[PDB]
Design a protein around this ligand. Sequence first.
Ligand SMILES: Nc1ncnc2c1ncn2[C@H]1C[C@H](O)[C@@H](COP(=O)(O)NP(=O)(O)OP(=O)(O)O)O1
Ligand SMILES: [Mg+2]
Ligand SMILES: [Mg+2]
Length: 430
Amino acid sequence: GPHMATGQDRVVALVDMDCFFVQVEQRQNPHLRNKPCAVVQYKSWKGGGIIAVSYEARAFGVTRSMWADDAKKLCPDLLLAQVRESRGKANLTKYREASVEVMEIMSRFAVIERASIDEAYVDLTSAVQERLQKLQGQPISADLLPSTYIEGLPQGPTVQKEGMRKQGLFQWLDSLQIDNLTSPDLQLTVGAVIVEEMRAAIERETGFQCSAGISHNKVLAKLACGLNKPNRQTLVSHGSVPQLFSQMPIRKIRSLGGKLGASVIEILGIEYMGELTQFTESQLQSHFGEKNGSWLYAMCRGIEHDPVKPRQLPKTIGCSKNFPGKTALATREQVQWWLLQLAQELEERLTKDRNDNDRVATQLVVSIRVQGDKRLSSLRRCCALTRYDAHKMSHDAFTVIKNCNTSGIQTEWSPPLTMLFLCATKFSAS
DNA sequence: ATAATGACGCT
DNA sequence: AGCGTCAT
Ligand SMILES: Nc1ncnc2c1ncn2[C@H]1C[C@H](O)[C@@H](COP(=O)(O)NP(=O)(O)OP(=O)(O)O)O1
Ligand SMILES: [Mg+2]
Ligand SMILES: [Mg+2]
C-alpha cells in the first residue's frame, strides 16, 4: 500500500571470517596453506575434537565436532593444528587477538556489533549516504564489485561460475536508478561497494579472507552471507525476498534454528519461511506469543528491526571446562583445583580488560553441571567480585556451590561434576 | 565425549 | 535471582 513500511530503511552487513581458526593457523604456519587442514582441540580422547576445517578438507567430508581420528579416516593427508592448552584447558587467546585485528579494521568504516569471535554486524546506513553525495550520481561500475553476487540474478532470457556472477551483477547494475539517492536498491549497492573495500582492507592488513552479506537488516544480511562462501559477498535486496524465502527452510533464519523454529513448523504445518505470509499477525501472536508473532509476521516479509548495537567488545568475561564421562570431578580437592585453574585464566583476562578496555567487573557467576543432567547448566549462583585475585575467586566460587555436594564423605564429591564455569559480569567504568 | 563462551528472554 | 533459549 501507500502507508506500508517495507523495512528498507537501513543498510546492514554481516561479515563472517572463512574457516577462521584455520586461517589463523595457516597464516602462522605457511606449511598448512592451501592444504586440507583442521584445527583440533585436545588430543588424548580419539585424537581431539575438530573445531574448524579448511575448504580443502571439507571436500573430503571432514566437519567440525568430528574426532580427529575419524577425520583422518575420511582424509588421511589431513594436516592438524592444535589449540594452545594452558592450565589443563583450551586457551583461545590467539584467536581472540586475531579477532581484534579484524574488528578494529571494520570499526574504521562503521559502527559494528560483535556477534561472535569471528562475526560482526555493520550498520552502513550513514556511510552509504555520504558516499552517495561523494559519488556525484555517476553509474556504479562493476569493477567496484568484483566479489559480489546479486541474489536472484541472473534471471530470464551461461556455464561458468564467475560467468554467472557477472551476468547477474550486470543485470542488476543496468537496472539501477542512480537518479534517486533514496532508492533502497541503490543504497544496498553502495553498501556492497563499501563492504568490498572493508573486505579488501582486512585481507591486506591481516591476510584473512571473509564472506559478507549486505541487506536491509541483520537476519537477511546473515542469510545473505552464507549464500556464496568462501571469499565472496552477497547482496540480498528487498525484492529478492519472496523467491528466496519460498524454498528457504524455516530453521535457517537466525533465532528459528531451535525449538521455536520446530514449533512454527509443527503447529502451522509448513516448511519454508515464505509460507508464514498467509497468516495474520494475530494468528502468529496467538501461537507463539505477542513478541514472537509480531517478529515472525514482519520477518517473513523480509522486515526486521533489531538494531546493530554499537558494541565491538563483550560485557561478560568467562571461562569454562567440561569434564565428560570418566573425567567427571568426584573429589572436593579436584573441584577446588579446577576452580582455581579457571579463576587464574579469568584473572588474567580480567586484568587485561581493566588495562586495555578501561573497566572492572563487580559480580561473579558460578555455573556447574552434574553427571546425567543434560542441560547446559544444572545450577547457577552469584557472589561479589571485589578483587581480581584468582585464589579468592576460586575460594568464593567453591563457597557458593559447596552445599550442592550430596556426599556423606565430603572428601568426595557427589553427584560428580561434568562442567565448571566462571563468569565475570556487572561491569562498570574505570 | 561434539567446547568454550556470549547474549538475551521469562519469571 | 536463577533458569531456559539460541548462537558461533
Ligand atoms: N563446535 C565448535 N567447537 C569449537 N570451536 C568452534 C566450533 N564452531 C566454531 N568454532 C570456532 C572455530 C571457528 O573457526 C570459529 C568461527 O565459527 P564459524 O564461523 O561458525 N565457522 P568457521 O569460521 O570455521 O567456518 P565458516 O565460517 O567458513 O563456515 O569459531
Ligand atoms: Mg566463520
Ligand atoms: Mg561465525
